Design an enzyme around this catalytic site. Structure first.
Site, PDB file in Angstrom:
ATOM      1  CD1 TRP A 155      15.947 144.753  -9.952  1.00  0.00           C
ATOM      2  CD2 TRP A 155      17.990 143.796 -10.003  1.00  0.00           C
ATOM      3  NE1 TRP A 155      15.782 143.432 -10.303  1.00  0.00           N
ATOM      4  CE2 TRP A 155      17.015 142.825 -10.343  1.00  0.00           C
ATOM      5  CE3 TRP A 155      19.344 143.423  -9.975  1.00  0.00           C
ATOM      6  CZ2 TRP A 155      17.356 141.507 -10.642  1.00  0.00           C
ATOM      7  CZ3 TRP A 155      19.681 142.117 -10.276  1.00  0.00           C
ATOM      8  CH2 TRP A 155      18.687 141.168 -10.595  1.00  0.00           C
ATOM      9  NE  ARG A 191      11.683 135.430  -0.675  1.00  0.00           N
ATOM     10  CZ  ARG A 191      10.847 134.711   0.068  1.00  0.00           C
ATOM     11  NH1 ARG A 191      11.300 133.774   0.903  1.00  0.00           N
ATOM     12  NH2 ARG A 191       9.542 134.927  -0.034  1.00  0.00           N
ATOM     13  CD  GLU A 204      11.882 148.579  -3.512  1.00  0.00           C
ATOM     14  OE1 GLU A 204      12.501 148.976  -2.492  1.00  0.00           O
ATOM     15  OE2 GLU A 204      12.372 147.788  -4.364  1.00  0.00           O
ATOM     16  CB  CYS A 234      12.935 139.649  -0.364  1.00  0.00           C
ATOM     17  SG  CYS A 234      13.755 139.947  -1.946  1.00  0.00           S
TER      18      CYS A 234
HETATM   19  C1  HEM Z   1      17.734 141.703  -6.940  1.00  0.00           C
HETATM   20  C2  HEM Z   1      16.570 142.358  -6.902  1.00  0.00           C
HETATM   21  C3  HEM Z   1      15.725 142.567  -5.629  1.00  0.00           C
HETATM   22  C4  HEM Z   1      14.461 143.030  -5.665  1.00  0.00           C
HETATM   23  C5  HEM Z   1      13.694 143.401  -6.953  1.00  0.00           C
HETATM   24  C6  HEM Z   1      13.959 143.112  -4.314  1.00  0.00           C
HETATM   25  C7  HEM Z   1      12.680 143.541  -3.957  1.00  0.00           C
HETATM   26  C8  HEM Z   1      12.259 143.812  -2.673  1.00  0.00           C
HETATM   27  C9  HEM Z   1      11.158 144.661  -2.243  1.00  0.00           C
HETATM   28  C10 HEM Z   1      10.215 145.466  -3.162  1.00  0.00           C
HETATM   29  C11 HEM Z   1      11.109 144.605  -0.898  1.00  0.00           C
HETATM   30  C12 HEM Z   1      10.143 145.368   0.027  1.00  0.00           C
HETATM   31  C13 HEM Z   1      11.008 146.496   0.599  1.00  0.00           C
HETATM   32  C14 HEM Z   1      10.137 147.579   1.147  1.00  0.00           C
HETATM   33  O1  HEM Z   1       8.992 147.665   0.681  1.00  0.00           O
HETATM   34  O2  HEM Z   1      10.611 148.345   2.029  1.00  0.00           O
HETATM   35  C15 HEM Z   1      12.203 143.747  -0.431  1.00  0.00           C
HETATM   36  C16 HEM Z   1      12.512 143.402   0.873  1.00  0.00           C
HETATM   37  C17 HEM Z   1      13.637 142.721   1.331  1.00  0.00           C
HETATM   38  N1  HEM Z   1      14.672 142.261   0.548  1.00  0.00           N
HETATM   39 FE1  HEM Z   1      14.592 142.033  -1.439  1.00  0.00          FE
HETATM   40  N2  HEM Z   1      14.964 142.678  -3.466  1.00  0.00           N
HETATM   41  C18 HEM Z   1      16.084 142.340  -4.232  1.00  0.00           C
HETATM   42  C19 HEM Z   1      17.305 141.882  -3.746  1.00  0.00           C
HETATM   43  C20 HEM Z   1      17.584 141.541  -2.445  1.00  0.00           C
HETATM   44  C21 HEM Z   1      18.889 141.071  -1.940  1.00  0.00           C
HETATM   45  C22 HEM Z   1      20.074 140.910  -2.896  1.00  0.00           C
HETATM   46  C23 HEM Z   1      18.755 140.838  -0.616  1.00  0.00           C
HETATM   47  C24 HEM Z   1      19.727 140.318   0.454  1.00  0.00           C
HETATM   48  C25 HEM Z   1      20.988 139.962   0.163  1.00  0.00           C
HETATM   49  C26 HEM Z   1      17.362 141.170  -0.276  1.00  0.00           C
HETATM   50  C27 HEM Z   1      16.798 141.070   0.978  1.00  0.00           C
HETATM   51  C28 HEM Z   1      15.600 141.629   1.372  1.00  0.00           C
HETATM   52  C29 HEM Z   1      15.104 141.698   2.725  1.00  0.00           C
HETATM   53  C30 HEM Z   1      15.794 141.114   3.976  1.00  0.00           C
HETATM   54  C31 HEM Z   1      13.921 142.339   2.699  1.00  0.00           C
HETATM   55  C32 HEM Z   1      13.046 142.608   3.947  1.00  0.00           C
HETATM   56  C33 HEM Z   1      13.393 143.991   4.490  1.00  0.00           C
HETATM   57  C34 HEM Z   1      12.455 144.341   5.633  1.00  0.00           C
HETATM   58  O3  HEM Z   1      11.952 143.384   6.281  1.00  0.00           O
HETATM   59  O4  HEM Z   1      12.268 145.557   5.914  1.00  0.00           O
HETATM   60  N3  HEM Z   1      16.722 141.591  -1.403  1.00  0.00           N
HETATM   61  N4  HEM Z   1      12.845 143.274  -1.549  1.00  0.00           N
HETATM   62  N1  LIG Z   2      10.309 155.158   9.492  1.00  0.00           N
HETATM   63  C1  LIG Z   2       9.480 154.255   9.200  1.00  0.00           C
HETATM   64  N2  LIG Z   2       9.686 153.011   9.655  1.00  0.00           N
HETATM   65  C2  LIG Z   2      10.295 152.016   8.949  1.00  0.00           C
HETATM   66  C3  LIG Z   2      10.900 150.945   9.606  1.00  0.00           C
HETATM   67  C4  LIG Z   2      11.504 149.919   8.871  1.00  0.00           C
HETATM   68  C5  LIG Z   2      11.501 149.953   7.475  1.00  0.00           C
HETATM   69  C6  LIG Z   2      12.149 148.867   6.636  1.00  0.00           C
HETATM   70  C7  LIG Z   2      12.292 149.349   5.188  1.00  0.00           C
HETATM   71  N3  LIG Z   2      13.083 148.402   4.373  1.00  0.00           N
HETATM   72  C8  LIG Z   2      13.864 149.072   3.303  1.00  0.00           C
HETATM   73  C9  LIG Z   2      14.192 148.040   2.241  1.00  0.00           C
HETATM   74  C10 LIG Z   2      14.488 146.760   2.657  1.00  0.00           C
HETATM   75  C11 LIG Z   2      14.796 145.779   1.727  1.00  0.00           C
HETATM   76  C12 LIG Z   2      14.767 146.057   0.373  1.00  0.00           C
HETATM   77  C13 LIG Z   2      14.484 147.344  -0.082  1.00  0.00           C
HETATM   78  N4  LIG Z   2      14.457 147.624  -1.421  1.00  0.00           N
HETATM   79  C14 LIG Z   2      15.195 146.997  -2.345  1.00  0.00           C
HETATM   80  N5  LIG Z   2      14.771 146.793  -3.513  1.00  0.00           N
HETATM   81  C15 LIG Z   2      16.585 146.550  -2.019  1.00  0.00           C
HETATM   82  C16 LIG Z   2      17.546 147.026  -1.163  1.00  0.00           C
HETATM   83  N6  LIG Z   2      18.686 146.258  -1.179  1.00  0.00           N
HETATM   84  C17 LIG Z   2      18.697 145.178  -2.011  1.00  0.00           C
HETATM   85  S1  LIG Z   2      17.164 145.141  -2.802  1.00  0.00           S
HETATM   86  C18 LIG Z   2      14.186 148.332   0.870  1.00  0.00           C
HETATM   87  C19 LIG Z   2      10.897 151.016   6.824  1.00  0.00           C
HETATM   88  C20 LIG Z   2      10.305 152.031   7.560  1.00  0.00           C
HETATM   89  C21 LIG Z   2       8.277 154.652   8.385  1.00  0.00           C
HETATM   90  C22 LIG Z   2       7.586 155.851   8.233  1.00  0.00           C
HETATM   91  N7  LIG Z   2       6.529 155.781   7.360  1.00  0.00           N
HETATM   92  C23 LIG Z   2       6.303 154.573   6.765  1.00  0.00           C
HETATM   93  S2  LIG Z   2       7.502 153.488   7.365  1.00  0.00           S
END
Ligand code: HEM
Ligand SMILES: N=C(Nc1ccc(CCNCc2cccc(NC(=N)c3cncs3)c2)cc1)c1cncs1
Ligand code: HEM
Ligand SMILES: N=C(Nc1ccc(CCNCc2cccc(NC(=N)c3cncs3)c2)cc1)c1cncs1
Ligand SMILES: C[C@H](O)[C@H](O)[C@H]1CNc2nc(N)[nH]c(=O)c2N1
Ligand SMILES: C[C@H](O)[C@H](O)[C@H]1CNc2nc(N)[nH]c(=O)c2N1
Ligand SMILES: [Zn+2]
Lengths: 412, 412
Positions: free
Chosen positions: B281, B112, B286, B109
């Site tokens: 947000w 953070r 994204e 993330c």
């Molecule tokens: C407040 C603004 C925030 C921004 C701008 C942000 C931004 C991002 C982005 C761009 C990603 C990559 C997601 C992707 O490409 O699929 C990500 C991943 C992630 N975010 Fe943040 N996030 C925010 C808040 C949070 C919050 C509030 C939490 C948890 C309480 C969080 C937990 C995570 C986690 C666990 C991932 C990893 C998800 C994965 O492994 O698929 N984020 N974030």
């Molecule tokens: N199905 C597929 N697998 C697949 C498996 C796992 C994943 C994981 C995708 N995490 C989605 C995600 C996680 C954390 C933050 C955001 N965004 C934010 N900003 C926030 C949301 N909440 C607070 S911040 C979005 C994605 C894809 C695929 C097919 N083609 C390419 S991947």
């Protein structure tokens, strides 16, 4: 022990067993991944023979004579030569195989679909810096081939004791100078400001401009290095124009055609080749993105955005992104219109997926470094962004080595 | 055992000792780096107390009462509760600490720097899917805050036996439907075509369009899940326009304002929270890069390039790159003009470097996943491209988990 890599855009799955033959270590442990560290981490006769045997067992396996008579005699021949000299000499065929597979094995190189079309120049008879100049001049001429570039490597004598090393002190055979200024600014290429000054110390007379091709500093058999000027007729350059914006000529930029890395070390069968300059051709982003737009390089996003009349007040207008795309359209257009070989990041990354399929099929895997394979712009709109890759060290290989000026027992 | 990470644009060096407190494993070994694999890899009372103690020793350390009376009594109190029930309950303060540090610890993330400004909603008294709908509705309303978005997490009861789990079957609370076609094409969001159909099986009446907000499938205490429609007044959406190109409205695209991940698992002190939807947000890329331009997503590079009148014949005209930048200028402009919170990749990646400096200073490190931190376009013109990062697993943490429909002992 039989790992799976997936492409998340095509759902294609490949099975890697090649990593089992991996020997060297990566820097990662079970508790820490170091896949984004830029540089991770004498040779005795005891260690030498297993390395020789391992190399010879895959060389002879490759020509479909594994364990045959010639293999066993060559194994004994090298063993006997390592007894007498605590080193040995590669056959010409073994040298060409080694080099091509060091490239094949380079996990950071997206170009590897060409790995077998490599011209190997055996410079192991070289003894002086003047002979190095000559060999390097012939490398440039051949590789450039009037713009229709051809991959090649020139291999100078292997390290022996250690204090007798052949080194090219340039980072690339062709490279632009960098000079600082009174006001602390920088003209030319800030990457090479230390090396540019080193040439001035050994005696270079610098034409203190932007795109001044550095001289060669060549060190033979451990002696102090010596300066040589590549004849300008061998140095092919490309003036950068845009296919729409005619003020782009006024930018008056240009780059050299031939990327030729000269500071790396080639390991083959436990033998170390400290001077092995190798050349192919450019992927466009190397020039337009990194060389031209790195903050610590030419750093031209400022001026291109100005002349495009962009909203530079805010970060979020994405003016930097907008001017980055124009600049790389310009590099590609200028190289192509001149019939000088270049590949765009889309074609090169697609070819690398195709290459990956070949390696997994007919070799069981393809070591690959995602951090380096994904290009420095438009990442996710190239297929390699979505391709899982396993990274691991196979040999023969290209390794980093210290700069000679930090290690050479200087002699004044 | 005291590792160094370097920034190669600023020459800044940081020392990581935080990785020593790392517990879980990464997937990498000394001979293979897996830092580009997308998903790497009941609970008994024996294993539970060390996890509880480890968490409580850092909680009490954090409030400057490590080893005090309250710590020892709480350690004994939890030990006694794990004897009687082979599990335990977090204090409200411990639950808020755990959640904030799971986010703090999320190496993928880039957001953070906000990790401590997180609103924690304790839904552990919930017992039915209707109560989940209610809690989730209040989460959306609060987090959205009229466009001035606020980070929040809602935490449903912890797993116990395993067959009594709270799950939200949606991937995100707010997510657009995906339907296939007779000609095998796809309308809406191809990411969610399986989930969209699942809602139809449990009984959804689909309005088969582009941007149809899916219903919630909510599973409480292991029972079969139940469909609920978020009131449209709580679903804030942003119509995408461009600040120059007026045909961009004719594209008629839009996205929802609130990204709210709902399918992950929160581990705190050895306790597993299978339903813990969290929202912040968007970083602009994204939507504009991945959602809109992934080949297996909305895949709109075709149409935007057409209306820009681009040379689409060749790969090397970089028309894809050119239309990618316009699209992300449009996402940002539309969100900002509407006062809906969004951050551009330049501001967000800069803040993450600043956050990294804070963590290394006052915490000894910051686990970071370069593959995920670097944004999917304009990589090297953001400071995180040039920042070495150490990745490692610290707890509390957010983990992946199977989709409930592949594991739930179905009941019809
Ligand atoms: C407040 C603004 C925030 C921004 C701008 C942000 C931004 C991002 C982005 C761009 C990603 C990559 C997601 C992707 O490409 O699929 C990500 C991943 C992630 N975010 Fe943040 N996030 C925010 C808040 C949070 C919050 C509030 C939490 C948890 C309480 C969080 C937990 C995570 C986690 C666990 C991932 C990893 C998800 C994965 O492994 O698929 N984020 N974030
Ligand atoms: N199905 C597929 N697998 C697949 C498996 C796992 C994943 C994981 C995708 N995490 C989605 C995600 C996680 C954390 C933050 C955001 N965004 C934010 N900003 C926030 C949301 N909440 C607070 S911040 C979005 C994605 C894809 C695929 C097919 N083609 C390419 S991947
Ligand atoms: C023929 C066309 C070739 C293309 C398009 C190509 C492309 C690239 C690119 C873009 C990189 C990343 C370099 C950087 O970002 O600094 C790279 C790295 C590398 N290439 Fe290739 N290359 C080609 C030929 C070769 C040849 C002929 C060799 C060896 C004989 C080679 C060996 C390597 C090695 C060892 C690296 C890693 C360098 C490092 O770790 O710093 N390449 N290549
Ligand atoms: N001084 C710095 N450290 C630094 C340390 C190591 C390095 C390693 C850079 N490899 C240069 C290279 C290597 C291989 C291929 C190409 N290209 C080609 N296409 C070909 C060339 N020959 C045949 S193909 C270019 C780079 C920088 C920095 C300062 N700021 C950012 S890095
Ligand atoms: C810190 C980081 O590892 C460093 O920027 C790497 C990232 N990936 C790269 N990829 C390529 N091709 N070339 C590079 O110089 C780098 N630099
Ligand atoms: C194969 C590869 O690991 C996969 O594309 C990863 C790459 N990096 C990513 N980075 C982010 N932020 N989100 C992603 O979905 C991915 N996907
Ligand atoms: Zn690793």
């Amino acid at each position: 022990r039989f790992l799976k890599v997936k492409n998340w855009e095509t759902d294609v799955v490949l099975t890697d067993t090649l990593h089992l033959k991996s020997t060297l270590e990566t820097g990662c442990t079970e508790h820490i991944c170091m896949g984004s560290i830029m540089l991770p981490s004498v040779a005795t006769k005891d260690q030498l023979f297993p390395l020789a045997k391992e190399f010879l067992d895959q060389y002879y396996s490759s020509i479909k004579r594994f364990g045959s008579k010639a293999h066993m005699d060559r194994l004994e021949e090298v063993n006997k030569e390592i007894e007498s000299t605590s080193t040995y000499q590669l056959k010409d065929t073994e040298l060409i195989y080694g080099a091509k597979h060091a490239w094949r094995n380079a996990s950071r190189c997206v170009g590897r679909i060409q790995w077998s079309k490599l011209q190997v120049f055996d410079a192991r008879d070289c003894t002086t810096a003047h002979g190095m100049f000559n060999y390097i001049c012939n490398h440039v001429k051949y590789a450039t081939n009037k713009g229709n570039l051809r991959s090649a490597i020139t291999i100078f004598p292997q390290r022996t004791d250690g204090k007798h090393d052949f080194r090219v002190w340039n980072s690339q055979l062709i490279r632009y100078a960098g000079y600082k200024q009174p006001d602390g600014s920088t003209l030319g290429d800030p990457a090479n400001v230390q090396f540019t000054e080193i040439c001035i110390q050994q005696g270079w007379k610098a034409p203190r401009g932007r795109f001044d091709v550095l001289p060669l500093l060549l060190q033979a058999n451990g002696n102090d290095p010596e300066l040589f000027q590549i004849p300008p007729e061998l140095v092919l350059e490309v003036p950068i124009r845009h296919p729409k914006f005619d003020w782009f000529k006024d930018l008056g930029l240009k780059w050299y055609g031939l990327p030729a890395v000269s500071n790396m070390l080639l390991e083959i069968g436990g033998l170390e080749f400290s001077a092995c300059p190798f050349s192919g051709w450019y992927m466009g982003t190397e020039i337009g993105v990194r060389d031209y737009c790195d903050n610590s390089r030419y750093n031209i996003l400022e001026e291109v955005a100005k002349k495009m009349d962009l909203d530079m007040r805010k970060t979020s207008s994405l003016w930097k992104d907008q001017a980055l795309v124009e600049i790389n359209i310009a590099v590609l257009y200028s190289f192509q219109s001149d019939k000088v070989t270049i590949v765009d990041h889309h074609s090169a990354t697609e070819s690398f997926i195709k290459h990956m399929e070949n390696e997994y099929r007919c070799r069981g895997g393809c070591p690959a470094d995602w951090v380096w394979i994904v290009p420095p712009m438009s990442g996710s709109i190239t297929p390699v962004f979505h391709q899982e890759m396993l990274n691991y060290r196979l040999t023969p290989s290209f390794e980093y080595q210290p700069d000679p000026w930090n290690t050479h027992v200087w002699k004044g």
